[PDB]
mmCIF file of C-alpha atoms and ligand atoms in Angstrom:
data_model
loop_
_atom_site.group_PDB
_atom_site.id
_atom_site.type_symbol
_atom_site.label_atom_id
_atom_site.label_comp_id
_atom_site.label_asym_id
_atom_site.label_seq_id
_atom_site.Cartn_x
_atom_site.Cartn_y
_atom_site.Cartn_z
ATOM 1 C CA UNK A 1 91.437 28.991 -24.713
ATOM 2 C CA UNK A 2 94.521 30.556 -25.795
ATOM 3 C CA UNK A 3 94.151 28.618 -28.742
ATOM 4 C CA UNK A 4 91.202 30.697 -30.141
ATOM 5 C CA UNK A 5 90.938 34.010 -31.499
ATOM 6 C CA UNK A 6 87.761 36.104 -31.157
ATOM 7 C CA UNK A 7 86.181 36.930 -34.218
ATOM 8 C CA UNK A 8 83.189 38.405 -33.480
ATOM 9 C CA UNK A 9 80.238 38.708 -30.698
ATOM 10 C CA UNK A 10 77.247 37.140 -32.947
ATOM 11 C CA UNK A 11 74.830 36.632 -29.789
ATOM 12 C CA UNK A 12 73.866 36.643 -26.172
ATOM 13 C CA UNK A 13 71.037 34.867 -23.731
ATOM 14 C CA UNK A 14 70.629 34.670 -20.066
ATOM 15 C CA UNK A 15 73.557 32.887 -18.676
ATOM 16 C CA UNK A 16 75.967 33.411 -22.136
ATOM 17 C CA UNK A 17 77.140 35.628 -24.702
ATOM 18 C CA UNK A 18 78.319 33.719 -27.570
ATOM 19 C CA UNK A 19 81.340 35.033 -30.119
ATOM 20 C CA UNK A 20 82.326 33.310 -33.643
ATOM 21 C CA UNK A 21 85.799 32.050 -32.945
ATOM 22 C CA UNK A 22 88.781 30.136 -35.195
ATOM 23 C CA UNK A 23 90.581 28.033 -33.717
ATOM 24 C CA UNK A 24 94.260 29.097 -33.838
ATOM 25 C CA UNK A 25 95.566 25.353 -34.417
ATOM 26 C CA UNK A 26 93.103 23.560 -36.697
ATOM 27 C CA UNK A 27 91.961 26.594 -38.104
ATOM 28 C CA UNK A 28 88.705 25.471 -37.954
ATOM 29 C CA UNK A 29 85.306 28.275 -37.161
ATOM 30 C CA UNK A 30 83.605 27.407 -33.900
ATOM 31 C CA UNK A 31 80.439 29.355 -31.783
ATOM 32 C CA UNK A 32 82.224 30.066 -28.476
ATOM 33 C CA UNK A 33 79.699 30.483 -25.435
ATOM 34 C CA UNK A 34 81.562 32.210 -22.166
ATOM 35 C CA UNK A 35 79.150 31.725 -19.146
ATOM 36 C CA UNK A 36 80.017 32.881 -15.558
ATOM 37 C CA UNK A 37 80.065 24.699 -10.514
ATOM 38 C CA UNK A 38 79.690 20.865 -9.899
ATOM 39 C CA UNK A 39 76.791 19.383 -10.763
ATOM 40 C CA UNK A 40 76.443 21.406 -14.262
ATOM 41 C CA UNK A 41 79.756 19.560 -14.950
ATOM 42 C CA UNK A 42 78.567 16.109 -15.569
ATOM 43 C CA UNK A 43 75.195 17.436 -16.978
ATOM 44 C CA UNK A 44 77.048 19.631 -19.899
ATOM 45 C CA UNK A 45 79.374 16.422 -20.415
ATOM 46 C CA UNK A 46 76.332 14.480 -20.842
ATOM 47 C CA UNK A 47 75.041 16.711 -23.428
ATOM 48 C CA UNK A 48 78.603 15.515 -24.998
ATOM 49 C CA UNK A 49 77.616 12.127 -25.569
ATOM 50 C CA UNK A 50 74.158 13.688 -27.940
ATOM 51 C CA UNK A 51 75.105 13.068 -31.439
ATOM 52 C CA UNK A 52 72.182 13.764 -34.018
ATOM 53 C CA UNK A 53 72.029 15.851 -37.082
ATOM 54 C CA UNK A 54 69.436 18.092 -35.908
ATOM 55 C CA UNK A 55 71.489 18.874 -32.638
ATOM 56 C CA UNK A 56 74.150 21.559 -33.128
ATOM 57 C CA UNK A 57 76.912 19.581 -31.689
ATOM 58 C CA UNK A 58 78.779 20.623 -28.459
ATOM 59 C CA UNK A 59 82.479 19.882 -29.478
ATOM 60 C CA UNK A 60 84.452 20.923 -26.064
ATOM 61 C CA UNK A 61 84.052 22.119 -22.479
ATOM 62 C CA UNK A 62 86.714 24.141 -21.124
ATOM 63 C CA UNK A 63 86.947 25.491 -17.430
ATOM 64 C CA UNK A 64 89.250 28.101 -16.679
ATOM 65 C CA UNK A 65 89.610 29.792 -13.934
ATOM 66 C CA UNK A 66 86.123 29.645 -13.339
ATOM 67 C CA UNK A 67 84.483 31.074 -16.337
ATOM 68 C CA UNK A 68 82.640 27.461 -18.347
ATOM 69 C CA UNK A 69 83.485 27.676 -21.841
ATOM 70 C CA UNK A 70 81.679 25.728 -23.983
ATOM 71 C CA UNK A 71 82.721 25.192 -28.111
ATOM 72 C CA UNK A 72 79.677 24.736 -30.347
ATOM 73 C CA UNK A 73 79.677 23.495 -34.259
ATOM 74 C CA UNK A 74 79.567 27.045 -36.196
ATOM 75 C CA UNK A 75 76.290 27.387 -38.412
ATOM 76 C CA UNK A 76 75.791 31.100 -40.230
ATOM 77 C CA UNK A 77 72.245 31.675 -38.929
ATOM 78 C CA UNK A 78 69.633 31.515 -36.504
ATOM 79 C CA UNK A 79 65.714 31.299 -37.081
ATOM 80 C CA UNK A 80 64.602 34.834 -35.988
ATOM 81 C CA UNK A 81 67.314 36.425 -38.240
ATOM 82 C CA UNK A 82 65.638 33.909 -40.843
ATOM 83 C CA UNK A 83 62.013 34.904 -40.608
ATOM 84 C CA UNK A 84 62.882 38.539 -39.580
ATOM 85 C CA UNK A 85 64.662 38.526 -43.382
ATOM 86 C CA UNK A 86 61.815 36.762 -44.543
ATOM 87 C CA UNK A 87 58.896 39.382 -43.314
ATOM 88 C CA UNK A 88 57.385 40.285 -46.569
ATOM 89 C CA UNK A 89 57.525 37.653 -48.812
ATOM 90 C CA UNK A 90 57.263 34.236 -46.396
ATOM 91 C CA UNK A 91 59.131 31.245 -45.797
ATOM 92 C CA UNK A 92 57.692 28.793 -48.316
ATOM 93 C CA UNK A 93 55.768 26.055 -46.774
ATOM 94 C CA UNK A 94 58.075 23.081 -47.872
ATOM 95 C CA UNK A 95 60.594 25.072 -46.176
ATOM 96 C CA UNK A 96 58.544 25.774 -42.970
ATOM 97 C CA UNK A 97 57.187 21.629 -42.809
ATOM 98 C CA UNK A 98 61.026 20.501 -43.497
ATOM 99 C CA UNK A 99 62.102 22.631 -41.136
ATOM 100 C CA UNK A 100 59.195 21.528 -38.382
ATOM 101 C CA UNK A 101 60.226 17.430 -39.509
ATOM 102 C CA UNK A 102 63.772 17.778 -39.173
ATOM 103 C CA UNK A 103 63.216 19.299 -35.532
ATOM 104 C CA UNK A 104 60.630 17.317 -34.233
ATOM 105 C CA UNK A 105 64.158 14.414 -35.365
ATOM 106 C CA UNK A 106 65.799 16.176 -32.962
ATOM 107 C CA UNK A 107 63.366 16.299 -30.483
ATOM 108 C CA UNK A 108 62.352 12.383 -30.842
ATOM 109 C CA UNK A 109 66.168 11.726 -30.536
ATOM 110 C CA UNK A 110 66.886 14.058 -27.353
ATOM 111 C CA UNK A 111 63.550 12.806 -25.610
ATOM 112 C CA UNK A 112 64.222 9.134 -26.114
ATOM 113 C CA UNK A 113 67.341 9.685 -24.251
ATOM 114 C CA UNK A 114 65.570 11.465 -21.357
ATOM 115 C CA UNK A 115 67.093 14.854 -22.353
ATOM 116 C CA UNK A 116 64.866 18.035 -22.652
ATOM 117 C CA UNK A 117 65.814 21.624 -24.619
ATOM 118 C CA UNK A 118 63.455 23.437 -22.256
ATOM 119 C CA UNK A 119 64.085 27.017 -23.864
ATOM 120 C CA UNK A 120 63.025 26.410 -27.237
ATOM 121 C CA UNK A 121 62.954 29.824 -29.588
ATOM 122 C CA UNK A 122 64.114 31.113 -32.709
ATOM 123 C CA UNK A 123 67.064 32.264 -31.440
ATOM 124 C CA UNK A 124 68.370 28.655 -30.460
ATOM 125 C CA UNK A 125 67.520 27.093 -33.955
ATOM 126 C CA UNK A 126 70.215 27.605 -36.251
ATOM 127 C CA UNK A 127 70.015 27.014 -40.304
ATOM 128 C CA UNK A 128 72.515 25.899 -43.292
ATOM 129 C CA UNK A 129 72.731 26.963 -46.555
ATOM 130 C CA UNK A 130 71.732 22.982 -47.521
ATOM 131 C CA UNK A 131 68.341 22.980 -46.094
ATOM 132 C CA UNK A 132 69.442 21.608 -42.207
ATOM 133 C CA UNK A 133 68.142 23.030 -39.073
ATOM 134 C CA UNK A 134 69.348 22.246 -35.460
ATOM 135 C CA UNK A 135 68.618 22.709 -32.458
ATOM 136 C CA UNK A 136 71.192 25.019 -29.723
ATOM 137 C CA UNK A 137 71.623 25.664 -26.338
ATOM 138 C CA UNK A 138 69.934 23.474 -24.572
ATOM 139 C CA UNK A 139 68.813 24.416 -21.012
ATOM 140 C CA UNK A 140 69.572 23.180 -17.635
ATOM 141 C CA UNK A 141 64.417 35.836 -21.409
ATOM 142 C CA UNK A 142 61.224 35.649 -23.458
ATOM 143 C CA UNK A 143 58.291 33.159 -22.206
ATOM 144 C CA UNK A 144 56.618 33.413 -24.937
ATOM 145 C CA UNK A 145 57.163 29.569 -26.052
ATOM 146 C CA UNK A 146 56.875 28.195 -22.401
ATOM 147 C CA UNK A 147 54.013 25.241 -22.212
ATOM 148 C CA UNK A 148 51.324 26.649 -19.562
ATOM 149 C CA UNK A 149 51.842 23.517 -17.249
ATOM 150 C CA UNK A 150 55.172 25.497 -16.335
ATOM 151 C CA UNK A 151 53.525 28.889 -16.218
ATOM 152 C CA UNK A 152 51.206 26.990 -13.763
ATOM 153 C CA UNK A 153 54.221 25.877 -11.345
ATOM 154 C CA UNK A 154 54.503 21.984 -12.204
ATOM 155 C CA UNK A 155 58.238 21.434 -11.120
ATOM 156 C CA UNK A 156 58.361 18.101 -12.839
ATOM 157 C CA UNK A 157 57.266 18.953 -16.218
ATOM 158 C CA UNK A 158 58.177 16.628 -19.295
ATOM 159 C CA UNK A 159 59.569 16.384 -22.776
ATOM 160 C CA UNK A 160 56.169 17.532 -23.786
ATOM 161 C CA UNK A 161 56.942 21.418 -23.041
ATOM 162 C CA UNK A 162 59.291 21.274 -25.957
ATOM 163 C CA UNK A 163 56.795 20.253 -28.347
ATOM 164 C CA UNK A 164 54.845 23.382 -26.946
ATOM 165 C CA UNK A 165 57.464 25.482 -27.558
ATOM 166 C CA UNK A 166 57.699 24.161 -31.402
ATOM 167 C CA UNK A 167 54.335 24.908 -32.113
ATOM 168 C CA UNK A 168 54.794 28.188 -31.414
ATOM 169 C CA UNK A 169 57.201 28.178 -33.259
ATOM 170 C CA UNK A 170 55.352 26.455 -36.222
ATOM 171 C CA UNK A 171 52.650 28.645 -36.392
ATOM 172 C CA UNK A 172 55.275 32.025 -36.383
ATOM 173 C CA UNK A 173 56.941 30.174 -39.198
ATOM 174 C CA UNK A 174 53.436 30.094 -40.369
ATOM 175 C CA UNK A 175 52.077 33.037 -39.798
ATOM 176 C CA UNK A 176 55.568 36.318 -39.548
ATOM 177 C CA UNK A 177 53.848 36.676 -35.976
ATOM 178 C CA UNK A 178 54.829 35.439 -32.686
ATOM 179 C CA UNK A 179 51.695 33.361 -31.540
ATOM 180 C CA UNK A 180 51.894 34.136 -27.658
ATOM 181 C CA UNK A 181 53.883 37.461 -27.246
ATOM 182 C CA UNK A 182 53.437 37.600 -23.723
ATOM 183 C CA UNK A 183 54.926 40.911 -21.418
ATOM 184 C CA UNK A 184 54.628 39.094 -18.323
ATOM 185 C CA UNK A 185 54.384 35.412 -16.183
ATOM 186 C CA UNK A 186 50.623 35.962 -16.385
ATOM 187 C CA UNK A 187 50.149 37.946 -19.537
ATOM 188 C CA UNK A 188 51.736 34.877 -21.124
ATOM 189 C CA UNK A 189 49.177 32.712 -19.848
ATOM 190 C CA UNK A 190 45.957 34.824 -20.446
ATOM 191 C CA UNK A 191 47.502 35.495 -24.144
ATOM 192 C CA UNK A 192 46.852 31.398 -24.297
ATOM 193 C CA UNK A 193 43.819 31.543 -22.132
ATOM 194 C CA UNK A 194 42.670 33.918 -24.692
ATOM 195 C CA UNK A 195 43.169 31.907 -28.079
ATOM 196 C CA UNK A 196 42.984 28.658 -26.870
ATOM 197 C CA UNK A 197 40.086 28.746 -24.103
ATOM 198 C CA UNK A 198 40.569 29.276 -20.061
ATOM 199 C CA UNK A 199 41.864 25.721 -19.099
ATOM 200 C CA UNK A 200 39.907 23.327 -17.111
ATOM 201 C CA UNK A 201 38.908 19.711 -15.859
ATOM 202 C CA UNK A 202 37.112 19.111 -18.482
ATOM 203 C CA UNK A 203 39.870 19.874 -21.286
ATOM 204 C CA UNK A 204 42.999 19.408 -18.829
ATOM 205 C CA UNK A 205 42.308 17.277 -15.593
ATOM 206 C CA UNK A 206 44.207 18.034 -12.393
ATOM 207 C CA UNK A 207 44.728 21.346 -14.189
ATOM 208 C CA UNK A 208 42.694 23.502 -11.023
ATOM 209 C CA UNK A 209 45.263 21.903 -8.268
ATOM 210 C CA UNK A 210 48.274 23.397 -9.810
ATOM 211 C CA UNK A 211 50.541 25.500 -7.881
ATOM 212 C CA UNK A 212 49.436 28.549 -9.603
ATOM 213 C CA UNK A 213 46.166 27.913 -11.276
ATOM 214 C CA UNK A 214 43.393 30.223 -9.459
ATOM 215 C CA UNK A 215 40.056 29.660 -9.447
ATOM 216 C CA UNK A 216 39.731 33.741 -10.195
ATOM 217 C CA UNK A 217 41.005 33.239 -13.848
ATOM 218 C CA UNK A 218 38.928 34.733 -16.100
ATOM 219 C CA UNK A 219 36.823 32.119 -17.962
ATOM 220 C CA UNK A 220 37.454 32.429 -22.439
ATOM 221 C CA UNK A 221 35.841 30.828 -25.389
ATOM 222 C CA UNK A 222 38.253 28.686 -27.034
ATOM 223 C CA UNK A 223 38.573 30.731 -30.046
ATOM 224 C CA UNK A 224 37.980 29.355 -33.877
ATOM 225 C CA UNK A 225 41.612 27.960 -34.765
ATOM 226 C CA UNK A 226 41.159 28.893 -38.035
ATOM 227 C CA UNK A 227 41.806 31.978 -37.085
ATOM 228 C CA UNK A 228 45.279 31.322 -35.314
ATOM 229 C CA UNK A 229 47.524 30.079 -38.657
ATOM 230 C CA UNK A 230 45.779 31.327 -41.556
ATOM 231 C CA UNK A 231 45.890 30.490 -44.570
ATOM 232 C CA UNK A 232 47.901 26.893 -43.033
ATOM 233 C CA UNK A 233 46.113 23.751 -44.610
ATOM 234 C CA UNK A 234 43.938 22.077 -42.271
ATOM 235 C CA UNK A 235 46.667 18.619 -42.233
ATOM 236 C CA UNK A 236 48.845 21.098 -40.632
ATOM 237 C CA UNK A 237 46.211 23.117 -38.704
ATOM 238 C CA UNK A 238 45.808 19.253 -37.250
ATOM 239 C CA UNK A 239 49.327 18.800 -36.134
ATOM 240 C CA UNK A 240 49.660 22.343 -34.450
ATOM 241 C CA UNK A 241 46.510 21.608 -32.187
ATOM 242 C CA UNK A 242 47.564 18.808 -31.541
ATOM 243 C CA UNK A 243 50.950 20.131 -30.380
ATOM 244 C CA UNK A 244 49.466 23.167 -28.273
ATOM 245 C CA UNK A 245 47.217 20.726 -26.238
ATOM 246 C CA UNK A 246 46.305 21.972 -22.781
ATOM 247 C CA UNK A 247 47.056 18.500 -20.751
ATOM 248 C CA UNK A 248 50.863 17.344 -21.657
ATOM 249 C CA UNK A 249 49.844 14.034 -21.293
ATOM 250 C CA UNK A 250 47.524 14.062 -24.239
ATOM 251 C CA UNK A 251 49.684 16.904 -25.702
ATOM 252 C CA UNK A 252 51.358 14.777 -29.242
ATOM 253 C CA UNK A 253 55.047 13.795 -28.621
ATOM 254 C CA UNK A 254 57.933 14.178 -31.125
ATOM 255 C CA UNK A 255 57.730 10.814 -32.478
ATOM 256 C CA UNK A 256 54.072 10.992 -33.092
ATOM 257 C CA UNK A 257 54.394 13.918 -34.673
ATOM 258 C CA UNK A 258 56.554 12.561 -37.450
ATOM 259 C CA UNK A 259 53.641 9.983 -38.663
ATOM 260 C CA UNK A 260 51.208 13.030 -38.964
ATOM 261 C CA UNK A 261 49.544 13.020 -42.401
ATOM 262 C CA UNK A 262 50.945 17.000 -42.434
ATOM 263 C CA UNK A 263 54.670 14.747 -43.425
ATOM 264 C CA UNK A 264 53.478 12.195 -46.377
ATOM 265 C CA UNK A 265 55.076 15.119 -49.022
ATOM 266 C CA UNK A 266 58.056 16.294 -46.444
ATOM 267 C CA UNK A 267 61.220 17.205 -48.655
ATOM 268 C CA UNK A 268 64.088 19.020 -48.481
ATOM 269 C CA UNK A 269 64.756 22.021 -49.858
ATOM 270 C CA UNK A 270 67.009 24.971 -49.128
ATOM 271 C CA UNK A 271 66.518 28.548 -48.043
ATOM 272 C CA UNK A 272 68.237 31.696 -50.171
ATOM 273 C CA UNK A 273 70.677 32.942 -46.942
ATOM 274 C CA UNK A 274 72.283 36.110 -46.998
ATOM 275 C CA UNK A 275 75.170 35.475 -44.914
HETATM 276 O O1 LIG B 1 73.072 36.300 -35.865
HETATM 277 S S1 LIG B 1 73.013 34.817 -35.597
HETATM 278 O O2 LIG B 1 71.815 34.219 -36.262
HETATM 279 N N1 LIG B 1 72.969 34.599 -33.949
HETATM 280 C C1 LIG B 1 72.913 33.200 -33.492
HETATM 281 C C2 LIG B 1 73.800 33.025 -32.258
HETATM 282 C C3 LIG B 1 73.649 31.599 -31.711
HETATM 283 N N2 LIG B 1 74.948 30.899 -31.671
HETATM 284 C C4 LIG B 1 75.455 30.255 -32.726
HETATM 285 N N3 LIG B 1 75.589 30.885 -33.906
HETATM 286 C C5 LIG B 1 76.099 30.269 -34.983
HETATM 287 N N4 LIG B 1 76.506 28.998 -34.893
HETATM 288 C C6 LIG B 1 76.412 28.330 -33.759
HETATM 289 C C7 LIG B 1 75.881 28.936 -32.628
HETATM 290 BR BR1 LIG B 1 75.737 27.973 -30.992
HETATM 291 N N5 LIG B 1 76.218 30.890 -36.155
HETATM 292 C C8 LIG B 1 75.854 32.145 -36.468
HETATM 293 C C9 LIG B 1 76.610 32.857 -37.412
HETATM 294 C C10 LIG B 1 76.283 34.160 -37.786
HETATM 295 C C11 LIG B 1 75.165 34.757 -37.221
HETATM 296 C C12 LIG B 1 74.402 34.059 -36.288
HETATM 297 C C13 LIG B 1 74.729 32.758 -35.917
#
């Protein structure tokens, strides 16, 4: 820890603020993440062991003193910075369904090995100048990607929440607008109830003896999905539906998601970065 120099202070969530760093030996530029402890130990050390592309990498753990520092590959920007420089004009859709492909890799890799992100945003997806995107900071202050079967109290939720959280994330690509810009816990959840139809046993089964469900919920027309991610083709209008389905058990997981017809003409190109 005495081996790296503070650069800079380039972010902060929840539990962390995060500072670009050089390392003072191998000279080398690294995202530093100061947190603050037992049982977090082996889980972060686990999250050592994830190697894929698409995953920012977690290079070291250091604990001093108490205080959990934890050494992240460097990449010059995250998604929000992206689309918040790309507000007028649009990310081009090869860009956005690379983009969508190359996470749903990371996804179908961290899911196969039991791991979940479970705070997907565009603050934890970080882009290259050559085209790559990767997912950060996995979990262990905005709800507005949080799947609804969380909202509704499930304690044992699955994988599936993160492909929630990427179609959201898809259709803001899509559309320069947050889909669900919730202000509160139930806000959130009438914000989907309002789009995407007041859940129930007939779309979602077991959905009414959820923790939190209430039989007072006010009762909404599914609303016309064209009108969600205009003007999206309807291959990728497929995909996203499929992705923000009510019932996570029917909701399309990662490795589905990459045989979608939406994928037949992925490519790879880059973004123009201002860094
Ligand atoms: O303004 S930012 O988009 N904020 C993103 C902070 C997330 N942490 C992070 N940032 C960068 N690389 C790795 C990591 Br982890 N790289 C990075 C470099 C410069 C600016 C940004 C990120």
């Amino acid at each position: 820890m005495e081996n790296f120099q503070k650069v800079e202070k380039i972010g902060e969530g929840t539990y962390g603020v995060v500072y670009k760093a050089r390392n003072k030996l191998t000279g080398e530029v690294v995202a530093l993440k100061k947190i603050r402890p037992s049982t977090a130990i082996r889980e972060i050390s686990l999250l050592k062991e994830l190697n894929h592309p698409n995953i920012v990498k977690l290079l070291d753990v250091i604990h001093t003193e108490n205080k959990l520092y934890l050494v992240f590959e460097f990449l010059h920007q995250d998604l929000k910075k992206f689309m918040d420089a790309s507000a007028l004009t649009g990310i081009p859709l090869p860009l956005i369904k690379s983009y969508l492909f190359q996470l749903l890799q990371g996804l179908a890799f961290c899911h196969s090995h039991r791991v979940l992100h479970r705070d997907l945003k565009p603050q934890n997806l970080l882009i290259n100048t050559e085209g790559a995107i990767k997912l950060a900071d996995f979990g262990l202050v905005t709800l507005w990607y949080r799947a609804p079967e969380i909202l509704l109290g499930c304690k044992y939720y699955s994988t599936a929440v993160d492909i929630w959280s990427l179609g959201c994330i898809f259709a803001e690509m899509v559309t320069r607008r947050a889909l669900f810009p919730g202000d509160s816990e139930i806000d959130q959840l009438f914000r989907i109830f309002r789009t995407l139809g007041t859940p129930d046993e007939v779309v979602w089964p077991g959905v009414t003896s959820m923790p939190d469900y209430k039989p007072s919920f006010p009762k909404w027309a599914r609303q016309d999905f064209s009108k969600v991610v205009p003007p999206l083709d309807e291959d990728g209008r497929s995909l996203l539906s499929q992705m923000l389905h009510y019932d996570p058990n029917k909701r399309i997981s990662a490795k589905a998601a990459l045989a979608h017809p939406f994928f037949q003409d992925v490519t790879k190109p880059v973004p123009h970065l201002r860094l």
